[PDB]
Amino acid sequence: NKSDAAAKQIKKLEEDFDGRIGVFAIDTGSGNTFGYRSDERFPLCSSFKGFLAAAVLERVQQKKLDINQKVKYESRDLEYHSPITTKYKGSGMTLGDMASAALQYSDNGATNIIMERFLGGPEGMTKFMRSIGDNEFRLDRWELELNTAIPGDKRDTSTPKAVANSLNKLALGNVLNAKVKAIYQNWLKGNTTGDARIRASVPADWVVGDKTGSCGAYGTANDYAVIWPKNRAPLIVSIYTTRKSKDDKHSDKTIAEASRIAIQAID
Ligand SMILES: *[B@]1([O])=C2[C]=[C]C(F)=[C]C2=[C]O1
Cβ of 169 below 6 Å from ligand 1: no
The resolution, in Å, is 2.5
User: What are φ and ψ of residue 243, in 5° steps?
Assistant: -130, 170
Binding site residues, as ranges? 46, 49, 106, 108, 212
Q: Give CA torsion, residues 40, 44, 220, 80, to 10 deg.
A: -170
What strands lie across the sheet with 19-27, from one edge to the other?
A: 33-36, 19-27, 235-243, 221-228, 207-214
Position 177, amino acid: N
Cβ of 45 below 6 Å from ligand 1: yes
Enumerate domains of the chain plus CATH numbers: 1-267 (3.40.710.10)
145 is catalytic: yes
Protein residue with its CA nearest to atom 7 in ligand 1:
81
Alpha-carbon distance of 139 to 154, in angstroms, equals 10
CA of 245 from ligand 1 middle (Å) equals 19
Cβ of 241 below 6 Å from ligand 1: no
Method underlying the structure = X-ray
DSSP label of 37: S
Q: Write out the DSSP string of 176-216.
A: S-HHHHHHHHHHHHT-SS-TTTGGGGS-TTSEEEEEEEE-S
- Confirm if 146 and 140 have CB atoms less than 8 A apart: yes
Name every residue whose Cβ is closer than 8 Å to that of residue 144 and which is 6 or more positions away in sequence.
Answer: 79, 80, 81, 108
- From 214, 241, 249, the mutation candidate for ligand 1 (largest count of ligand atoms within 8 A of CB) is 214
Question: E-strand spans in 86-197?
Answer: 93-94, 157-158
